[PDB]
Scaffold this motif. Sequence first.
Motif: not given
Lengths: 242, 146, 129, 126, 109
Positions: D9-11, D23, D7
């Motif tokens: 967007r960090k928690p 990849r 993702s």
Amino acid sequence: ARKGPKRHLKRLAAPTSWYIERKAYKWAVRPRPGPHNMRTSIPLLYIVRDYLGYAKTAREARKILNEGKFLVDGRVRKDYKFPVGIMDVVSIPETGEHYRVLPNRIGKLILHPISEEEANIKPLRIRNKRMVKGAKIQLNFHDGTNHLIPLSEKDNYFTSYTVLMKVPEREILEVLPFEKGAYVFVTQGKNVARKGRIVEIKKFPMGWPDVVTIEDEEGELFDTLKEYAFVVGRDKPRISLP
Amino acid sequence: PGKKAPNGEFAGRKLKLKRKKFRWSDIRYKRRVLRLKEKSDPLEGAPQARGIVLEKIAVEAKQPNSGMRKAVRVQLIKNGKVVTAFCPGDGAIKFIDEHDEVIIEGIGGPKGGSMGDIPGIRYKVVKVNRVSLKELVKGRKEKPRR
Amino acid sequence: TLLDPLANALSHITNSERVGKREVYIKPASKLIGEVLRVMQKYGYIGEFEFIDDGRAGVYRVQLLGKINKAGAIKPRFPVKARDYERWEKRFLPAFEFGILIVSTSQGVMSHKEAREKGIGGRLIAYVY
Amino acid sequence: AIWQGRSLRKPSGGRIVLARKKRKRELGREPSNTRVAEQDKRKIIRTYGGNKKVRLTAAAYANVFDKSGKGRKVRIIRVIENPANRQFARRNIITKGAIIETEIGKAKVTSRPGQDGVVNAILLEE
Amino acid sequence: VRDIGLRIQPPAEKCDDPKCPWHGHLKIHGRVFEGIVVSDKPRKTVTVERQYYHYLKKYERYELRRSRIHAHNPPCINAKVGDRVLIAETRPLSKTKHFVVVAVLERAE
RNA sequence: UAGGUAGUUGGUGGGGUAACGGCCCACCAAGCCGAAGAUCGGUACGGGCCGUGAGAGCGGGAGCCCGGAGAUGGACACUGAGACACGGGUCCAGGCCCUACGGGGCGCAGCAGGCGCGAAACCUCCGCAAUGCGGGAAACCGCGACGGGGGGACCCCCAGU
Ligand SMILES: [Mg+2]
Ligand SMILES: [Mg+2]
Ligand SMILES: [Mg+2]
Ligand SMILES: [Zn+2]
């Protein structure tokens, strides 16, 4: 290490049980996949050329290899990338000598010379045990080699036992049980290459492996992991250990 | 004043914070972490540089002294700046001509600034037309390109 | 307020003996204080001591002999391994066996010279020399 | 171009700047929406490592089952109440919780059609 | 009484879901921690806190540190705020839940 | 540089994957990080190690080994056990080259060599005999990897006038 598998090997980053000179050249041999793992085995070239000295360059060691001169476990090997490992019996049938691969007292590999009537049996540790089609039992050994037994002898072959098989034929004889009282020889760790009898077995919950306590001849209780103790004989060993 | 502030056993965080807070009242550290020498430096972190001389000038010396020190105006090449550089030696200014290329080092004073009675100058000339100046001053070599 | 009844005692002792007194009164008396007096005695720094009860934690009378240069408390109470003593003996004492360094080992209170014979460690509480 | 990697967007709510590229081993494919029809069509895919995946695309039979382990291959009529998506039971898309209406009662699907290439069901009780 | 490889005592009820290690089809394997709950606002998830000491080396003193993680909370041992819990490690359950509560100690105080 | 987040945090049912997962979707909620520094800016490849000091410490992480990432900048697929491929294929942007003016091509952060920039950095050399890799049943064949010399006050050790 980006798109695919590694294919070369450096002298600096080589396994530290090999007896090689790490600054003389740049490349070492990348061992082909095979019987034992890579921290307990050595290619076949470093025995023909460096350990025993029958050759001086590799080009003249790969000429006597593919002429049928070297018999690793009773059968002829020809490529210079074959891994030789613990409790193997390399044998040169023309010169008339025999050897056994074993770990040193500080961790490297040697070629302790043995008899001829003893160059015919090989010890094998049991690593796992499962059931295959037809309801038979498959025993998986310590160097990735297998054997089948009926569903009526499933009571003699628990894991961590030891089996003694004739080398080029693989017919079982004289299973050695694991318990208190048996004779063990250590394989890896910090107590490498020490013998003795078993005194205790201790078990832990939630994943961690179990430990074994050993007593040697002069009298000293030490301990190792349970799967590092290789059972070789009960009350008196069978292999000519050094 | 009392003893000294956070001398407790479980007061590591406050002690480290007090040190990091007062290390900024320094000047050698603030000037090395914020990198203030670059961004204001005509030579850009080099030990030497090269320019092309515009005019030849003379400066007056300090108060308890008398005399005129000869110098030149150099127009750098990597920047386009204009600096003022000093020509060391007895009679050197007669070997520097306009439209010449000169090499420039520091003058070696306190803190990297200026030295002695020439107070505003902070560079000195070492090479003229790819021929060292020290030689030219004492015979021993002849000046190319006229 | 009061935070350390052991430091007060050791500073009182080294302040009194420096002006020539021959008796002191260590007013708030733990049994850690008594335990450290016990080992300041066996090495010959103080005379004899007694515990007097006064209804509120008791007092200690101790007679001085004028045989100590300095005593104090190692306060933050660092821990030591059984093979790392010299690093601290080179910080507090003036020569290679000059005086004792008191250690709160897991078998009581003792000087570092008897901790090195058993090979154990603990918290340093004080030093006398 | 259906990337199933991480993702961005960090928690905590701060954004992330990607450090590499995508990849080929992380990608995804299209949903194979199974329909009802009078002839079932299915294709075959080659997957990571050289394996295969049979992929059903239209459905004709049902393989309905019972409590005594007695199956019967009977054909289906229509879907009613697919809890997965709100507008599937109308378009006749069979996913996995679908309530199939065979010609011998009702039934509940217990297999993944887009992965196995068959439809299985248990004879739902009233 | 069933064990799962922890040598501890099972809960006194029965569950429903399959994400429960005691009654369902989940397997636990890894680390085993212990803390106290600091929130259970959303459904079936808690937040567990534990504390330790960091040892600086230049100043040779200590320093207090924390760690907040998130754990699945099966319906047979539903834990509130302010009680000790034992938690174990298993596969990823959501974006940020990788542990599971297995036993509750000291409910109220 | 004090508030930040709205597929953002979680649940229920699913799709997709080699595989678990808000990784995607349809519904139900109002959670999630934060003055013990969240968010936003700045600078930076990470480590084994290296310089300096009596030590506590302060400063650096080009060359050797181990991990990561890139092939003029940005997007995307085919074959394969493995690639969205430095000497394999499309499209856009930005440069250049051959053409019978209709059309074709190329991109050295591989080894030598050239231009530009700068205070600042070498030969357009000989070989598969050694260490290894790919191919082959084998003898063998290829390799600017590796091995041998050429240029240079690169660092150490031992001597001359
Ligand atoms: Mg789900
Ligand atoms: Mg950078
Ligand atoms: Mg140079
Ligand atoms: Zn349960």
